[PDB]
Design an enzyme around this catalytic site. Sequence first.
Site, PDB file in Angstrom:
ATOM      1  CG  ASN A 141       4.223 -13.835 -22.414  1.00  0.00           C
ATOM      2  OD1 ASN A 141       3.859 -14.442 -23.437  1.00  0.00           O
ATOM      3  ND2 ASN A 141       3.402 -13.182 -21.636  1.00  0.00           N
TER       4      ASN A 141
ATOM      5  CG  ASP B  58      -7.701 -16.554 -17.730  1.00  0.00           C
ATOM      6  OD1 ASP B  58      -7.447 -15.569 -16.967  1.00  0.00           O
ATOM      7  OD2 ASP B  58      -7.064 -16.685 -18.821  1.00  0.00           O
TER       8      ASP B  58
ATOM      9  CG  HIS C  85      -5.266 -12.750 -18.188  1.00  0.00           C
ATOM     10  ND1 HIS C  85      -5.570 -14.090 -18.272  1.00  0.00           N
ATOM     11  CD2 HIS C  85      -4.147 -12.563 -18.929  1.00  0.00           C
ATOM     12  CE1 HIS C  85      -4.670 -14.691 -19.038  1.00  0.00           C
ATOM     13  NE2 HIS C  85      -3.790 -13.788 -19.446  1.00  0.00           N
TER      14      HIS C  85
ATOM     15  CB  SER D  93      -2.437 -14.500 -22.210  1.00  0.00           C
ATOM     16  OG  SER D  93      -1.944 -15.079 -20.996  1.00  0.00           O
TER      17      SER D  93
END
Lengths: 281, 64
Positions: free
Chosen positions: A155, A32, A64, A221
């Site tokens: 998404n 990430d 994130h 996520s």
Amino acid sequence: AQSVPYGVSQIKAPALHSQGYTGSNVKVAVIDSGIDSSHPDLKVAGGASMVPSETNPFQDNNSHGTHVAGTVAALNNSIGVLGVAPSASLYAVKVLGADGSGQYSWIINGIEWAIANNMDVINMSLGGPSGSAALKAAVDKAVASGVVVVAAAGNEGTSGSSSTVGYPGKYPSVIAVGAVDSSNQRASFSSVGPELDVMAPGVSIQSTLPGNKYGAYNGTSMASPHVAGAAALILSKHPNWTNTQVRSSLENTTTKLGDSFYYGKGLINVQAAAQHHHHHH
Amino acid sequence: MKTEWPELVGKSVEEAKKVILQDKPAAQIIVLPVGTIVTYEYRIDRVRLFVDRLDNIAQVPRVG
Ligand SMILES: [Ca+2]
Ligand code: NA
């Protein structure tokens, strides 16, 4: 006082905690944007950065990775939130820069690092719309080597009868995770397709943010690390179970929701997954 | 509410920014190279624009 975010309760992680299992000694790579290792509700065990201009994996300039890490493993104490697997050995594998993007080769290098460093679980709350042979080879290699590989489905919402699952989630070797809310309804943004495997909470998920903060984020996520954390709980209770077995345990014990095109097998239930005998509830 | 702009594919990044800000003036626009991997959080205020090496839009812009 510590708060337990609703999604941790929704997947039945507290049942494993009450049995005494919290992911101890299980190594989870969060592949990430980095993890803020100074956060008092996180303990980062190690890591590496594959981002050429951001060499410190313990500095998260996006936020994130730190949020995703807290859903996996925020510490069990009297502060902040509680992670799904609060004793997991958490590794920051930085492959995304501040702007939230990375080159395919950076992601692949991070997957290779995880294999070389004997990670038990990889979470990838990330993806792109196309595959590559080298990306597929890296995830297939991690799985062949015994790693449980979990990724966010994307998404992209719906597009008629077309799959909108991103890569690497869309590869058979990777568990692709979609998002539901607290009522078990699919989030409108959650990607769909025959590659969707399971769902987990992905709406208004409270977790850790850099500079000793907390906040609610939305996305597949956020759903993915519930499943990566559940894998770590399962391995802490059954340390000899293979990745094959951890994956089937999660798939075979979901609470079935709607049509599999939109919901996959349904919501994960880590209490049922971590029993010897598996069925859906 | 407009949330996707398929008519912008093949236009310049500059025209895409102008059009998106007319429809969604508070948009947080970020330009990224097409063919990268990105974070999968959902941000209702954000519009990512994926450009080719010529700086033209290479993927349908959408909110998220
Ligand atoms: Ca805590
Ligand atoms: Na998959």
